[PDB]
Design an enzyme around this catalytic site. Structure first.
Site: not given
Lengths: 376, 376
Positions: A146, A284, A313, A332
Site C-alpha cells: 500500500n 507516524r 489511535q 488513518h
C-alpha cells in the site's frame, strides 16, 4: 491451526457497502520491479471491502476448508479482550496497522503457540521485534502493498492545504460564493521548495509525483539515495531535518518512527521554517510533537497541517488535531484504500499458502524469521 | 483617460486579510517558454490580494499619477448598475472572469469611448468578439497568467474524488474514526485511465502532472497535438469525446465553450462511461448539462464530480450542484489564487503601460486588435 485475526469494525450502514464501481485497475508490479502478490487463488473480487470484521481479508473459506480455526474480532484492548483471551493457543496472528493487535513482549510471552505474526499491510510497528527474535517466531508483511496509496494521499493533502480547498468546498456546500474569502489563503504549489523526510519506497513515490508540479525538491535521509535518483529528480540532499526545514515551504514526512525521529518535528524544528510553511505527515504521528503542531498553527508558524496518522489511535473524540486551525486531517485510511486492500489481502493469502505448504515465504516479505532480523 | 474596472467584493472580515505568508515563489516563465509579465514597476508585493474592490489590481497610484480616472466597482448587473452608468465614457474596461463585466454587443454599442477591453486573467468569454471586431476596439488578456493554477486545482480535485477525501475529513473534524466508512469509496488513482478534453496550455499541464501517478493517459482535441508530445507522455488520442468516454475512468475538461462543446457532457456521453466514473470540470460549466450531472451522481453512473465553474455565476444559493451526491465543488477560484493574481495584475499593468505610451502590446496578449481577430 488456529488463526487469530483482528480487523476494524464494519461500515455504519452494514456489510457489504454499496460499491461505487465493480472493478479496479490490475497492478502488476511496483516501481522498483517487485511483483505484486501471487497467491494461487483469491476468494474476492478486487475492489471489495476486506479489512473489516465481515470482510475477513477474504480468508475464511480458504482457511476453514483446510481445517483451520479462524477467529475474527475487532476487540483487541486489554487482557479481558477477545484477542488476549484467544491468544494463548493461536498459531498465527494477523492484523492491520489501521487497527493493530499489539504483540508486546508480555503478550508474546503468553502466546504459547505463536509461530507467525503476519501484518496485513506494511511494516511491524505494533510488534516487539526483540521479543519476536528471542521467541523464534516469524514476522512478515506484504512489502510495498500500500505504499503508492500513501504517496497519493500525501500529495493530495499537500495540494489541498496550499490551495485552500477544504474551507472553499465548505463555502460551496453552505450556499456561499465569497471569492475573496476562498482565495485569501490560496496559493499555487508551483515553484515552492518541497522536501521529504526519507526517500524510501513511499518518499520516492511522493518525490516523483511532485516533480512535474515544477517545485524545487529536497530530502533528508539517514542513508543517502544513489546519485542516479538525485539526478533523475533534481534532488537537493540535507544531512538533517533541521537544515531542510530552513529552506522548505512544504515538508512531507515518510520516515519510520525510532528514537532519532520521535518528536523530531517539535517547536525547535518548526521555528526553523519560514512563517506560513506547510507540513504533511502520513508516516507516524509521534514524529511530530502533538501540542507543538497545535501551537504552530495557532500562531501561524504553520499555515497548514494534514495527515492521517494520530497519537493515541484511534484518536479520541477530544484529540486536539481534529479542530486545530487550518488542518486537513483524515482518520488513518491511506493504506486501506480498496485498491491497497486488494493487494495486501492477496499477499496475506500468498504468505499463508507458503506457510501451510512448507514453502519459503518471499525473502522481501520477511521482517524476522527463525531468530534472524532482516533490517535493524 | 477613464478606466472602468470591475472586481469582486472584499473579504468578509475586511481588507486587507491576514496573510499566511509574506512572500511567494518568483515564476520566470511558462512551460512553453513564454515569459511572465514584465511591467516597468509594480505597486504591490506579490502575494497580496489584488482581485477584490479594495485590492484594485494594484493600479490606482499608477493610473491617478498620470491623470487618469479609475473607477472600481463590484456592481455590474443590469442597466442601472454602476458599471453600465459609467460605461458610456470609459476609455478602458477591465474585469476578471471570476467576476466579469459583460461586454455584449448592446453594451459595446453604448460604450462610445471604448478602445481597450482588458481581461485581468485569461480569455475573453465575457466579451462579444464579433462586435469588438466591428467597433475597431482592442481586446487583450494576460495569456497563460493563471493556467498552472487551474491545472493544479484540477489534479487536486481528481485525487480528492477518487480517494474519498472530503467525507473522510468531515469524519475527522466531527469526532469520528470509522475507517470502514472512510474507505468504502476510497480508491487509488494509480493505473486508472484518465483523459483530458483538449491538450492546450492547461490540458497539457494537467497531463504532465498526472503522468507520474502511473495512469494510462488519453485525450481528445479538435487539433491533434504534435507526435513529440504524444510520445513524451504516452498519450492515446481520440477523435471524439464520446470515444474517449468509453475507455476512461476519469475525465478532466480543459476545452473552451463553443457550439461543439456546449452540453457535450450530457446523459448520452455520461452513459458511455463505465458506471462509477469521475468527471472534473475547471473549464466552463455549460460544457456539462447541469441536470444530467445531478442525475448521473444520483444513479451512481458518476462516482464523483468536482469543478469550480458554475452556470449562472455567481451560483445561486439554490444551485443543485452544491449538494448533489459525491461532489467536490468550490466557488470559481482556481485562476484567482494569490499566486495567479500576482501574474495577471502585473500583466494588466504591463499592457496599460504599453497602451498609454503608444508601444505595441505583446502579440501573444492580443485577442482582437484594430478589426483583426487572432484566433477564431
Amino acid at each position: 491451526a488456529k488463526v487469530l485475526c483482528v480487523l476494524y469494525d464494519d461500515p455504519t450502514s452494514g456489510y457489504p457497502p454499496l460499491y461505487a464501481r465493480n472493478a479496479i485497475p490490475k497492478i502488476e508490479r511496483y516501481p522498483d520491479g517487485q511483483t505484486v502478490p501471487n497467491p494461487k487463488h483469491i476468494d474476492f473480487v478486487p475492489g471489495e471491502l476486506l479489512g473489516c470484521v465481515s470482510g475477513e481479508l477474504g480468508l475464511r473459506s480458504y482457511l476453514e476448508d483446510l481445517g483451520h480455526t479462524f477467529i475474527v474480532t475487532s476487540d483487541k484492548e486489554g487482557p479481558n479482550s477477545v484477542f488476549e483471551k484467544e491468544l494463548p493457543d493461536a498459531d498465527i496472528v494477523i492484523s492491520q496497522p489501521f487497527w493493530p493487535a499489539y504483540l508486546t513482549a508480555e503478550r508474546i510471552a503468553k502466546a504459547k503457540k505463536l509461530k507467525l505474526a503476519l501484518t496485513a499491510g506494511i511494516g511491524s510497528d505494533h510488534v516487539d521485534l526483540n521479543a519476536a527474535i528471542k521467541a523464534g517466531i516469524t514476522v512478515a508483511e506484504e512489502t510495498f502493498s500500500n505504499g503508492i496509496c500513501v504517496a497519493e494521499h500525501a500529495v493530495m493533502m499537500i495540494l489541498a492545504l496550499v490551495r485552500n480547498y477544504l474551507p472553499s468546498h465548505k463555502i460551496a456546500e453552505e450556499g456561499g460564493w465569497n471569492i475573496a474569502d476562498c482565495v485569501s489563503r490560496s496559493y499555487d504549489l508551483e515553484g515552492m521548495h518541497v522536501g521529504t523526510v526519507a526517500a524510501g519506497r513511499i518518499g520516492l513515490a511522493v518525490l516523483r509525483r511532485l516533480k512535474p508540479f515544477d517545485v524545487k525538491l529536497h530530502y533528508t535521509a539517514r542513508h543517502r539515495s544513489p546519485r542516479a535518483i538525485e539526478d533523475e529528480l533534481g534532488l537537493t540532499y540535507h544531512a538533517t531535518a533541521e537544515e531542510m526545514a530552513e529552506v522548505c515551504d512544504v515538508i512531507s514526512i515518510h520516515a519510520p518512527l525510532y528514537p532519532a525521529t520521535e518528536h523530531l518535528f517539535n517547536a525547535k524544528v518548526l521555528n526553523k521554517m519560514r512563517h506560513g510553511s506547510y507540513l504533511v505527515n502520513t508516516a507516524r504521528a509521534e514524529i511530530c510533537d502533538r501540542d507543538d503542531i497545535v501551537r504552530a498553527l495557532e500562531s501561524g508558524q504553520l499555515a497548514g497541517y494534514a495527515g492521517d496518522v494520530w497519537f493515541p489511535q484511534p484518536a479520541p473524540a477530544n484529540h486536539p488535531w481534529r479542530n486545530m486551525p487550518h488542518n486537513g486531517m483524515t482518520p488513518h485510511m491511506s493504506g486501506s484504500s480498496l485498491s491497497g486492500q486488494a493487494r495486501y489481502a492477496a499477499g496475506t493469502r500468498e504468505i499463508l499458502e507458503c506457510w501451510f505448504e512448507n514453502r519459503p515465504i518471499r525473502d522481501e516479505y520477511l521482517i524476522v524469521s527463525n531468530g534472524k532480523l532482516a533490517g535493524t
